[PDB]
Amino acid sequence: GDDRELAILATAENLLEDRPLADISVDDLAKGAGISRPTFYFYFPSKEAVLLTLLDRVVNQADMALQTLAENPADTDRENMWRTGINVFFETFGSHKAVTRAGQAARATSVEVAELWSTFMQKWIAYTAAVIDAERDRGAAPRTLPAHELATALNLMNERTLFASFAGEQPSVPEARVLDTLVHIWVTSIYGE
Amino acid sequence: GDDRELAILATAENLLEDRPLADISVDDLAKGAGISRPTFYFYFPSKEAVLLTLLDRVVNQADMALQTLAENPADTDRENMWRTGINVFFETFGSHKAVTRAGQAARATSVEVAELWSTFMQKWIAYTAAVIDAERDRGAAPRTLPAHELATALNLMNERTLFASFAGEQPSVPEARVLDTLVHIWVTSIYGE
Numbered sequence A, B: 001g002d003d004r005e006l007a008i009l010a011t012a013e014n015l016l017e018d019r020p021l022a023d024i025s026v027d028d029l030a031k032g033a034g035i036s037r038p039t040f041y042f043y044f045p046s047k048e049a050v051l052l053t054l055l056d057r058v059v060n061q062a063d064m065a066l067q068t069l070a071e072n073p074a075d076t077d078r079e080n081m082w083r084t085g086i087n088v089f090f091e092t093f094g095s096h097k098a099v100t101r102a103g104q105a106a107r108a109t110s111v112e113v114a115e116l117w118s119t120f121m122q123k124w125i126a127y128t129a130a131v132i133d134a135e136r137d138r139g140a141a142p143r144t145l146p147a148h149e150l151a152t153a154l155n156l157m158n159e160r161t162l163f164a165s166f167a168g169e170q171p172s173v174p175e176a177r178v179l180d181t182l183v184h185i186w187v188t189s190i191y192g193e
């Protein structure tokens, strides 16, 4: 039952490494999960809905790791604090590149996918802003831009830059340089007066 | 002749303010430009090709203004130097939001649109890097990240952040705050040690 479901998801994540959702059929997903097409439809309304669930899992996995970090602060300087935080996104989305890629593309055509991304981006920006405000209240960061506006731009940077790297777009930062690239820009923009 | 062409382009830019290219037909573009559908096809192979030309004009307009700035440096501090530069993109794309929006969406489905964006992004990053290197050679900016990697991330930030603002995405920086937001992050990341 729930195994049929995980099989469908695993099959879909697999096929998305080789081709776009447009080039994967419900028959393709049924076949791969070892069920019939009507049986597939019992579990999921559409292949689109399969993507949404995979994206939902990746996004929630990043979110939960971030919550875990927030509750268990690493004992380091402020540079490594931010690095650790950004790394949650680097590793989580980096471990799920096909889903990341197909999820980002589906924003154009799926109101549910766009709202899912938007909901979590808003949550992550609000967390980023709270940390910057904490740092300013401590007197560690100067009061420059509105914290929420700064957080917005830094989070949008991370989205576009990480996803460009992961897809090997031209242009992009090499994947092996992207973490340090983002941490430098976070730290200088957050602490620079 | 060439007036028929400009009419087709003007009609298309107009209709893109109200709806996506998917919801505009060749008949829609012919009608609006005051020609028949076969006459349209003499000027353009497809509505897709109409978008590509509009994008090509916007992109080249930004590029030419940037070249003009590069040849005629404003007499100011380094903050305003960068502000002026970013402003070329803010104003040029900001003046053509429907084309910006539909052009960005067509990257997913048009190899020509994707290569056009990629070509100019590469050119603008290379220019950004040359300026950062100039500043480092002058001893005004410290030698931190590789200049080209830093430029890549800053340019990808600007793309995602400006386009989010212009489309009124959730989340986004308000359009009236986006310029100062980007300049602060450019200046701190470029000059901060």
Ligand SMILES: CC1CCN(C(=O)Nc2ccc(C(F)(F)F)cc2)CC1
Binding pocket: A066, A081, A082, A085, A086, A089, A090, A093, A121, A124, A125, A127, A128, A131, A155, A156, A158, A159, A160, A162
């Ligand atoms: C999928 C996209 C791309 C990756 N994103 C991030 O990297 N944002 C982010 C948010 C918070 C922190 C913090 F505060 F923990 F350091 C670090 C990074 C945004 C979502």
Ligand SMILES: CC1CCN(C(=O)Nc2ccc(C(F)(F)F)cc2)CC1
Binding pocket: B066, B081, B082, B085, B086, B089, B090, B093, B121, B124, B125, B127, B128, B131, B155, B156, B158, B159, B160, B162
């Ligand atoms: C359409 C997208 C979004 C906007 N973009 C920029 O803002 N990039 C940019 C490049 C160079 C300079 C400089 F060096 F002149 F300051 C300032 C800004 C990238 C292209």
